[PDB]
Amino acid sequence: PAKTMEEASKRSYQFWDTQPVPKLGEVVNTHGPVEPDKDNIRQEPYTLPQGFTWDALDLGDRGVLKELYTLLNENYVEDDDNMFRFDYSPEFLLWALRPPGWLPQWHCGVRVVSSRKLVGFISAIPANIHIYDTEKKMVEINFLCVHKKLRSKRVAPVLIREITRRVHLEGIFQAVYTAGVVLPKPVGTCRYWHRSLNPRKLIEVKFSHLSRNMTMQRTMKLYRLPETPKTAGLRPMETKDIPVVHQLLTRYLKQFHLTPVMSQEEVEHWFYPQENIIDTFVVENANGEVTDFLSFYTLPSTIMNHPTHKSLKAAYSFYNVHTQTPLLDLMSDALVLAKMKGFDVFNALDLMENKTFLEKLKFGIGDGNLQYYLYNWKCPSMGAEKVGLVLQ
Amino acid sequence: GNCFSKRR
Ligand SMILES: CC(C)(COP(=O)(O)OP(=O)(O)OC[C@H]1O[C@@H](n2cnc3c(N)ncnc32)[C@H](O)[C@@H]1OP(=O)(O)O)[C@@H](O)C(=O)NCCC(=O)NCCS
Ligand SMILES: *C(=O)CCCCCCCCCCCCC
Ligand SMILES: [Cl-]
């Protein structure tokens, strides 16, 4: 795999060349499907290597959810230097995998026939996506995982082909997804930035280190935050705020070129606060009207091979809508709330309007690009600031 | 999936 576009240019994509996506080399000047909708779909699951079987995961069974948690906790995405690994909690996985419209067969697992050991996974959830001037029912693909012992044995193309078939069976022919690797072919490239909240811990674990020109004392002072947020009438989102959060979000996203289109039920699901999953705060002003909101989700990571520090508590910027409060004060209160809640770092991408506040609010640029992709949709690429979609 | 990032 290639994280850089440099190394990607020097690569051949035996699998991705067979798929309906534009080549890495060409530039796209059209808008529409790479290939037409299929009117007959393969009825049989693709063949797995001998010894392995498909199994749709009922995440409502606490034991099956636990197996999925353990598979991801041990085999999911790591940083470049194999220092950190995502540690999605069981309850988070329920939030991300059972939004409105979710289907059991779209939680696509692979098991060992003898042991029943879950060794592979991929998922789809449905979502209406707005891309330039078109609104399409698509799926979001996420959590593509192959066990470390099964790696490099051609299993990931099978999982991709099998989730495609199951999606095609439901009448859907486009998908959106992200990855840290360069693949054919990104619709846009975003970059993670990080805002230190607990800088001591971040340096001891080598998520960060000191500037040569700054001491630990200075570094702590530079990242010191106030104890309480500054914005008047900031408060956690409540049931009564669902219509207006939906309204503010819908109008705010119209300025970008790749966005979700959410029903009001989807807004409840994605934004209604769940402890250790998703936080949303609204701004109710002096007239009683909600004019702004901020949101971030909770995604800790395992710290591998460390005798003292085992986990890194990370908050991830989600959707932040401003119409009266300045965005920079909105994100300043997000940092304070994340600090108050015990987070060690606050992550945000450079998409939407985030660049206007990243340097001012003392974020440091990360080493990982997040690539955005459409499947079976040909359209021009776009700068990060036009991307208005945040996955988990 | 997502992608893990760290500083630099
Ligand atoms: C990512 C993962 C599932 C791929 O499995 P693998 O055994 O290493 O790769 P395989 O031998 O099965 O096949 C390689 C093919 O899969 C492709 N591939 C690799 N990572 C991919 C990704 N995130 N998304 C889509 N395709 C990917 C490769 O591009 C390659 O196709 P190509 O020949 O056209 O280049 C596996 O490495 C894994 O579980 N990693 C940890 C979690 C992770 O990174 N998940 C994906 C998040 S985007
Ligand atoms: C993160 O886990 C993303 C891994 C993405 C794998 C690419 C699969 C994309 C195609 C999905 C099927 C499309 C159905 C129309
Ligand atoms: Cl389920």
Numbering used by the authors:
A (entry chain A): 105 to 496
B (entry chain C): 1 to 8
Sentences from the paper on this structure:
Glycylpeptide N-tetradecanoyltransferase 1, commonly known as N-myristoyltransferases (NMTs, EC 2.3.1.97), are universally conserved eukaryotic enzymes responsible for a major post-translational modification (PTM), myristoylation (MYR). These structures reveal snapshots across the entire catalytic mechanism including the reactive intermediate state, thereby providing the high-resolution map of MYR reaction chemistry.
The free N-terminal Gly2 (aa2) of peptide X is hosted in a cavity (pocket 1) built by the side chains of Tyr180, Tyr192, Asn246, Thr282, Leu495, the C-terminal carboxylate of Gln496, and the myristoyl thioester of MyrCoA. The extended peptide conformation and Gly2 positioning orient the Gly2 peptide bond antiparallel to the MyrCoA thioester, with the amino-terminal group at ideal distance (3.4 Å) from the reactive MyrCoA thioester carbonyl (CM1). This carbonyl lies in the so-called oxyanion hole formed by the amide backbone of Phe247 and Leu248 (equivalent to Phe170 and Leu171 in ScNMT). At the active site, Gly2 is constrained by three sets of H-bonds. The first set anchors Gly2 at the active site through direct interaction of its amino-terminal group with Thr282. In the second, Asn246, Tyr180 and Tyr192 interact with the aa3 amide nitrogen via a water molecule (wat1), ensuring correct substrate orientation toward the catalytic base C-terminal carboxylate of Gln496. The third set of H-bonds between Gly2 and the Gln496 carboxylate are mediated by a second water molecule, wat2, at the end of a 22-Å-long, 544 Å3 solvent channel connecting the active site to solvent. The HsNMT:MyrCoA:X complex was obtained with a long NMT construct bearing the N-terminal B′A′-loop.
